[PDB]
């Protein structure tokens, strides 16, 4: 009936949850541990303030956040009805911050593009152009050295990252770094 989705900031300071469509109130029950096999309404809960945003979604902020507590949430609808509950473990919905201090260097004598900046990374690089044409490379390691068709061209490079275990979100792509030779 009503879907609630959540994301934890890369500083681990808060979790932001969103939902959209009587009077309506998000309630939550925090576990001392995690999420059960099957989420349920619990008699003990607290309300959250949610605010309607211009995209038509309500947004609610949990700050600070208990990263390893299961938050079961639902919408209380006025008799009263409860929407189907869902449970989230905040540490699993982290969106990491982007890799920072991205550097892109061509060394002529070596003949490679050197890029530098537990996680996996994707790198994308292309001729600095217009709408750039991106090639993409994946690292499962700090710094990588790729071949390029042209050692004298200027390339734009971005890196993003995600948990090595595949849980959570990808970061945004870093601010573009530009090669120097």
């Amino acid at each position, epitope marked *: 009936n009503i879907n609630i989705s959540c994301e934890t900031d890369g500083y681990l300071t808060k979790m932001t949850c969103r939902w959209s469509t009587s009077t309506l109130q998000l309630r939550y*029950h*925090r*576990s*001392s*541990l995690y999420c059960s096999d099957i989420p349920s309404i*619990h*008699p*003990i*809960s*607290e*309300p*959250k303030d949610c605010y309607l945003q211009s995209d038509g979604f309500y947004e609610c902020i949990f700050q*600070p956040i*208990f990263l390893l*507590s299961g938050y079961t949430m639902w919408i209380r609808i006025n008799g009263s009805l409860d929407s189907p509950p869902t449970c989230v473990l905040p540490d699993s919905v982290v969106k990491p911050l982007p890799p920072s201090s991205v550097k892109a260097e061509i060394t002529i004598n070596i003949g490679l593009l050197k890029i530098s900046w537990n996680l996996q990374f994707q790198i994308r690089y292309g001729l600095s152009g217009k709408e750039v044409q991106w090639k993409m490379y994946e690292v499962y390691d700090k710094s990588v050295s790729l071949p390029v068709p042209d050692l004298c061209a200027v390339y734009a490079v971005q890196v993003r990252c995600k948990r090595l275990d595949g849980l959570g979100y990808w970061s945004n792509w870093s601010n573009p770094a530009y090669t120097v030779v």
Partner: antibody, heavy 117, light 107 residues
Framework: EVKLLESGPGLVAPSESLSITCTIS????????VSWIRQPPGKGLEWLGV???????YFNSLFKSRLSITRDNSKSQVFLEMDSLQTDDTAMYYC???????????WGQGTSVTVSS | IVMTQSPKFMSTSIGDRVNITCKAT??????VTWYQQKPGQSPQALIF???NRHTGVPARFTGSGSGTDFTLTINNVKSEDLADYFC?????????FGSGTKLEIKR
């Protein structure tokens, strides 16, 4: 480390009021709830009420006509008030911290309250 | 919701094993916590969410059960276990406690 420490009056005369302060450290009152519980001589524990992290307060129906629980986050204090005490309100009085919405993880030292003329 | 502990007292010896039970008058799922209360002291948590150990509680304390029937088991009894043990349900309001079982130790 989490600590709770109650400060109360020791003695309350009949029909007068009980005020107790619970001073906490090692956590924030806005992240978790704090309850009040009492233990009368020779009897079972009795939960009186809670003030949750977000500030909502629930009382035991048996005491709602005469309880207040409030707090001052800035001073890390939670305050109990109970009005119109009588003899059978004599008890040890405790504050205790909650861990989310499923258990109480730490108790205070307790403060003895005797109601007597 | 009433949490009934039928044994008021139980007598054991050093190194034996003891079972302390609590029965709820309604379904409280796994939201049951066991506490130890030594003479002249505050309660301290042993087991929360029916079967999980509080920080620092030795492995010889275990808990089991769900629904209405719960058990704390103390293996390898030691002298410092001299105490009152009682349950809490933390499923709905009012929160309610069992009346306790006092552990007595033969020597």
């Amino acid at each position: 480390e989490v600590k709770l420490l109650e400060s109360g009056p020791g003695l309350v005369a009949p029909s007068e009021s009980l005020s107790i302060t619970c001073t906490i450290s090692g956590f924030s009152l806005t992240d978790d709830g704090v309850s009040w519980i009492r233990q009368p001589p020779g009897k079972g524990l009795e939960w009186l009420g809670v003030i949750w992290g977000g500030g909502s307060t629930y009382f035991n129906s048996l005491f709602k006509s005469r309880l207040s629980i409030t707090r001052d986050n800035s001073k890390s204090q939670v305050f109990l008030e109970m009005d119109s005490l009588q003899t059978d309100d004599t008890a040890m009085y405790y504050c205790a911290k909650h861990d989310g919405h499923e258990t109480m993880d730490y108790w205070g030292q307790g403060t003895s309250v005797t109601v007597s003329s | 919701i009433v949490m009934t502990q039928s044994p008021k007292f139980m007598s054991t010896s050093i190194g034996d094993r003891v079972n302390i039970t609590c029965k709820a008058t309604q379904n409280v799922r796994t939201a049951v916590t066991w506490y130890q209360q030594k003479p002249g002291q505050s309660p301290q948590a042993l087991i929360f969410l029916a079967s999980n150990r509080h920080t620092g509680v030795p492995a010889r304390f275990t808990g089991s059960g769900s629904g209405t029937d719960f058990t704390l088991t103390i293996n390898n009894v030691k002298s410092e276990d001299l105490a009152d043990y009682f349950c809490l349900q933390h499923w709905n309001y009012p929160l309610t406690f069992g009346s306790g079982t006092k552990l007595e130790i033969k020597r």
